[PDB]
Amino acid sequence: SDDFLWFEGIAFPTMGFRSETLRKVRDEFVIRDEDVIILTYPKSGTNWLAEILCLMHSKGDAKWIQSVPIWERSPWVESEIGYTALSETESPRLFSSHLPIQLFPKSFFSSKAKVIYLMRNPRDVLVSGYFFWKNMKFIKKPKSWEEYFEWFCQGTVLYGSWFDHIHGWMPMREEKNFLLLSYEELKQDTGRTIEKICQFLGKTLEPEELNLILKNSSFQSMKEYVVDKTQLSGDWKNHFTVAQAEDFDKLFQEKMADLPRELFPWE
Amino acid sequence: SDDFLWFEGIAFPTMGFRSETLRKVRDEFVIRDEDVIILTYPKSGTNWLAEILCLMHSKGDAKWIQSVPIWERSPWVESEIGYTALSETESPRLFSSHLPIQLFPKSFFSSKAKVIYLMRNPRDVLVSGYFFWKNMKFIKKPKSWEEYFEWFCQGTVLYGSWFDHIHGWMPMREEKNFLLLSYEELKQDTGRTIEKICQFLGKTLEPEELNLILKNSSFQSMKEYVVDKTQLSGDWKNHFTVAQAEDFDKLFQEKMADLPRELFPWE
């Protein structure tokens, strides 16, 4: 048991993903200009973003969003289920992806499809991944926190290096059809962030529609195969030892050096 | 099972300590002016200090120090064994104690006995205590690191609050018969520290005697009932989470406020 789908240098969940499909996503999937895409390193806040975009679509009514699953309202192009859905779906399409740039649909780079890339403090991302993946069946889990930590810094985890994932997509931060958001600005000022998404997508909204959306898309609202049915806590500081923080800092600085430090809002 | 000897508001090991004896240590034990005493909050570096004082006595020859146990070469006045030994021992006497000031022999405060008080970064002290006490039989051990941490900050551990232990003895830092040392200066500059101990005790040494002592009393040299025979790792930063460090800082500052911050060499 290796416990993961090794594809083109990137690890993938054993289930729901086939090598062949991955090869198609890159070589054949067709991106439409009308498409709206959510790009995120896993555990960076995809659902919140996704949920916000659905609220903007329904103009506040959270009933469909409440009935339909995440994977249905915004499928993962790279997955079996999703790749299928997206293909036979009427434009305009809303989907998500955790794929690094070198494996993203080739048709995309020739299109005018709008992409919203959401990044988050990697430390939180690491914490969030640990407690998520170690609660998933049929997935190589870590012997301990110490081990997973090591994995993450090495990029050996599902979807590869965070640093890599970030470096690849950053050269697009200034394209007109590319909106770079931070999970921190999303949680700190959901309205300003919704405002940005609104201009970027070119969607206008009546005052009362914005209020409902702002209402139904708050951190309070948001808060609402499994190894332990029970879990179905804090902040990264509640998990990194002081030594891991210093080592992590040193690592973050060494790998993100070639980038404007001011891109990453977190201290 | 309570698992500890509660005496006058301070917890004690269940074995080797009797309430009655404790009452005597305070009320009856007689301190001689010729006495040399090592005062330390447990896990602050008593053995290193003790080992240094024996080396200074033997002028370098570490054979007795090698054959005789710590509890024999410098007994704990508060213990059954030690209280016995100290009583029927010829002056000058060298012993140790972890007792807070309000429980120290009353005869002491009228004597001219020389006391060396060694303190150490409480964070290390906490780490060192956890891995020590949880490897001792017949001693209430913590359910986890989180719990012990909480105990220590509350002073609920053996020998009570560190902060308390420190506050009580600090008013003596300027007495002529009282030498205040830091474990950090002992590890950083063993020679200067041995120099201080030498003047304080008024002991002179031939160059070759100092070299041997300096040799036999280095951090390298130093490094050399048990639940796990095996253990018979890092620094405090390898154990406190970032959150515990910040909470600890905040706590240290709130409790040590009434003292010159510059007394504590650690950052």
Ligand SMILES: C[C@]12CC[C@H](O)C[C@@H]1CC[C@@H]1[C@@H]2CC[C@]2(C)C(=O)CC[C@@H]12
């Ligand atoms: C693991 C994950 C992608 C990594 C995410 O941040 C956690 C997601 C859980 C839901 C998964 C999804 C991959 C594709 C799946 C398998 C589907 O198509 C339906 C369930 C979907």
Ligand SMILES: C[C@]12CC[C@H](O)C[C@@H]1CC[C@@H]1[C@@H]2CC[C@]2(C)C(=O)CC[C@@H]12
């Ligand atoms: C626990 C301790 C005092 C707290 C120390 O930092 C760890 C020491 C271990 C050796 C113990 C000593 C108390 C008194 C004892 C019981 C003796 O008299 C012989 C063995 C001695």
